[PDB]
Write an enzyme that holds these catalytic residues in place. Structure first.
Site, mmCIF file in Angstrom:
data_model
loop_
_atom_site.group_PDB
_atom_site.id
_atom_site.type_symbol
_atom_site.label_atom_id
_atom_site.label_comp_id
_atom_site.label_asym_id
_atom_site.label_seq_id
_atom_site.Cartn_x
_atom_site.Cartn_y
_atom_site.Cartn_z
ATOM 1 N N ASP C 137 0.838 -1.195 0.000
ATOM 2 C CA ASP C 137 0.000 0.000 0.000
ATOM 3 C C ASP C 137 0.873 1.245 0.000
ATOM 4 O OD1 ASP C 137 -2.316 1.585 0.067
ATOM 5 O OD2 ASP C 137 -2.683 1.194 2.201
ATOM 6 N N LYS C 140 3.281 2.613 -5.730
ATOM 7 C CA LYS C 140 2.993 1.647 -6.792
ATOM 8 C C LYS C 140 4.223 1.336 -7.652
ATOM 9 C CE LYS C 140 -1.941 2.790 -6.946
ATOM 10 N NZ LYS C 140 -2.946 3.703 -7.612
ATOM 11 N N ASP C 165 -2.944 -2.903 -2.881
ATOM 12 C CA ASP C 165 -4.064 -1.970 -2.852
ATOM 13 C C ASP C 165 -4.109 -1.053 -4.073
ATOM 14 O OD1 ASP C 165 -6.354 -0.961 -1.334
ATOM 15 O OD2 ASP C 165 -5.252 0.945 -1.376
ATOM 16 N N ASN C 166 -5.330 -0.624 -4.420
ATOM 17 C CA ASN C 166 -5.570 0.380 -5.462
ATOM 18 C C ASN C 166 -5.000 -0.072 -6.807
ATOM 19 O OD1 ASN C 166 -5.498 3.646 -6.459
ATOM 20 N ND2 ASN C 166 -7.063 3.042 -4.975
ATOM 21 N N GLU C 195 -22.168 0.841 -2.962
ATOM 22 C CA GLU C 195 -23.481 0.842 -3.595
ATOM 23 C C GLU C 195 -23.479 1.449 -4.996
ATOM 24 O OE1 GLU C 195 -22.757 2.754 -1.017
ATOM 25 O OE2 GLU C 195 -23.495 4.798 -1.380
HETATM 26 C C1 LIG Z 1 10.440 3.124 -1.116
HETATM 27 C C2 LIG Z 1 9.321 3.308 -0.140
HETATM 28 N N1 LIG Z 1 9.256 2.687 1.005
HETATM 29 C C3 LIG Z 1 8.126 3.042 1.710
HETATM 30 C C4 LIG Z 1 7.905 2.423 3.049
HETATM 31 C C5 LIG Z 1 7.326 3.972 1.091
HETATM 32 C C6 LIG Z 1 6.081 4.569 1.514
HETATM 33 C C7 LIG Z 1 5.092 5.152 0.739
HETATM 34 C C8 LIG Z 1 4.107 5.564 1.638
HETATM 35 C C9 LIG Z 1 2.825 6.265 1.288
HETATM 36 N N2 LIG Z 1 1.924 6.174 2.439
HETATM 37 N N3 LIG Z 1 4.449 5.255 2.916
HETATM 38 N N4 LIG Z 1 5.674 4.646 2.802
HETATM 39 S S1 LIG Z 1 8.003 4.406 -0.440
#
Ligand SMILES: Cc1nc(C)c(-c2cc(CN)[nH]n2)s1
Ligand SMILES: Cc1nc(C)c(-c2cc(CN)[nH]n2)s1
Ligand SMILES: Cc1nc(C)c(-c2cc(CN)[nH]n2)s1
Ligand code: NA
Ligand code: NA
Ligand code: NA
Ligand code: NA
Ligand code: NA
Lengths: 215, 213, 212
Positions: C137, C140, C165-166, C195
């Site tokens: 999450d 992407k 997710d997404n 809905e």
């Molecule tokens: C290379 C990345 N590691 C992590 C943990 C990332 C990230 C992205 C988000 C958005 N909530 N939180 N942590 S990007």
């Protein structure tokens, strides 16, 4: 895990020159750049803060919000002998870090750190901390509190003619009530210094909208 | 030179003339090096590609050109006969975008309009022979997404099925635009999350000097 | 004062301490004021996946404001750990406060850093053998690289559930082509409409089958 503020302080202690406020500020900057963490106040806004302080030479400054102490070091290093910074911080761990950052900078004797909420501490300034009027207020705490606390400061008799309020983040995230109030009021003469804010490593998003025809 | 001119020079020195993919890869390569530079989003580019391939728009309006990355990326997927119209308020950015498209070999698919969106949009039908738009990419000043959407409606430039894709609706954020198209029965909306490594926006400090009552 | 910091202030001034449900309901309440119930669309799938597989060790990539961490941690059986990686230090701090207020801090360990830096350290520094579930999450752009990295580090076993997710358009076609094309993953796609007629959220479940 260590707090964000603890890690910044540790980098300062390991790399900055003791008793050298400029070295402390540069080490905070260097660490945030290396970590790709956005700075609350960086050098751009810092230069505006420096210019205001040098113009008005405030003897008593009130700071609302301390964070890791960068802004406290930035302002305290320009204060004249005898002058004093009072910093309000709601988070006890940020208040401790700010104290230790100022200690490393050699600025401990110029700053008093108050732990609590602005609306609880402001009414105590007269009696408990022997304040007459403030020469300058730096507002950088919860944005929905800028206008209430400004009105509270006025109601408590803590403002004098010529008191400088310097408010950060009035565009982003923004304090539109505060701006509309002080600009519209004959009690405030207002100047806006444009600058920038940086976001680093944040969730964003896109919207797809399909037009359905007139309705 | 300007930071966008340097991106253009890097493309012209390293990419293959006539190869849009090469141009796109060169911009990506250069922007990743430069710490001042907005990085290109992989998943975001794939969303843009998929929207264009799904709807096969014959006429696209792009608001906000920057340096020409998005104009190259979209125009490379347009079918023969289709065109992209790009509005850009900064004259140096409009010129660089034109040079980027020339290097990619895509200039025949694109018309760059240098000016403000709310001045140019009312001129599309009469001056640029637009009937209705098939797709609109909103990527200009965030406080303009909502008024320019309302203006596109008022000018009769949207038809049923027209696709609007808006970037950065969370950071810096366009809550009034989102409230409008989500709450309006004239728009069917879908949200895609994304991640921003870096973004710089305008902010400021207010100096307010108390005068007394 | 940030957009995520105000969610935390709203929870603190509205939810019941120690009650993960009212914390989730407070966030759901807050986010629906200003609009789509992604918490429900996404969380309904997360709940069903967690309840089917009863994972004892969950790795969460990305935390944002802590909603998903509270969502999964509240369902974990006694003795189960959630490891949560969050690259943004302000979001890591918020998530910790969110978990503290819900009373779930002892189930969760928040790691503030980048997944490509942290995943190679899970076995040595955080006493991980293999993971039972991964929730993707975060970025992407990192869905496929981190899936490959989790394999390379030996952190998946037969039956480890990945849940991404997404995945709607999809903006992650390379990730999908990999897990669907690979005989090492059995895949299920979920599209949540609530809905409405549009997808509110879409998720890919990919179950590792072992090295091949
Ligand atoms: C290379 C990345 N590691 C992590 C943990 C990332 C990230 C992205 C988000 C958005 N909530 N939180 N942590 S990007
Ligand atoms: C009502 C409030 N008073 C104060 C001193 C606040 C604050 C905000 C920050 C930044 N996290 N530090 N202190 S909020
Ligand atoms: C009112 C405006 N019209 C246009 C075309 C704008 C714009 C914004 C950018 C990105 N900097 N390029 N062009 S703002
Ligand atoms: Na600030
Ligand atoms: Na005024
Ligand atoms: Na860059
Ligand atoms: Na709608
Ligand atoms: Na497969």
């Amino acid at each position: 895990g260590d707090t964000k503020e603890q890690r910044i302080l540790r980098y300062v202690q390991q790399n900055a020159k003791p008793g050298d406020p400029q070295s402390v500020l540069e080490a905070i900057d260097t660490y945030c750049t290396q970590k790709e963490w956005a700075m609350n106040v960086g050098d751009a806004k810092g230069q505006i803060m420096d210019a205001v302080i040098r113009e008005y030479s405030p003897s008593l400054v009130l700071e609302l919000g301390a964070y890791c102490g960068y802004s406290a070091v930035r302002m305290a290093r320009l204060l004249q002998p005898g002058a004093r910074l009072l910093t309000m911080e709601i988070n006890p761990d940020c208040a401790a870090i700010t104290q230790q950052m100022l200690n490393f900078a050699g600025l401990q004797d110029k700053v008093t750190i108050l732990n609590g909420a602005s609306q609880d501490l402001i009414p105590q300034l007269k009696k408990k901390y022997d304040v007459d009027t403030l020469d300058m207020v730096f507002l950088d705490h919860w944005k929905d509190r800028y206008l209430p606390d400004t009105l509270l400061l006025e109601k408590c008799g803590l403002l004098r003619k010529g008191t400088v309020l310097l408010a950060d983040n009035v565009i982003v995230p923004g304090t539109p009530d505060f701006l509309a109030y002080v600009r519209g009021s004959s009690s405030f003469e207002c100047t806006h210094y444009s600058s920038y804010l940086e976001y680093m490593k944040v969730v964003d998003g896109l919207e797809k909208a399909i037009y359905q025809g007139p309705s």
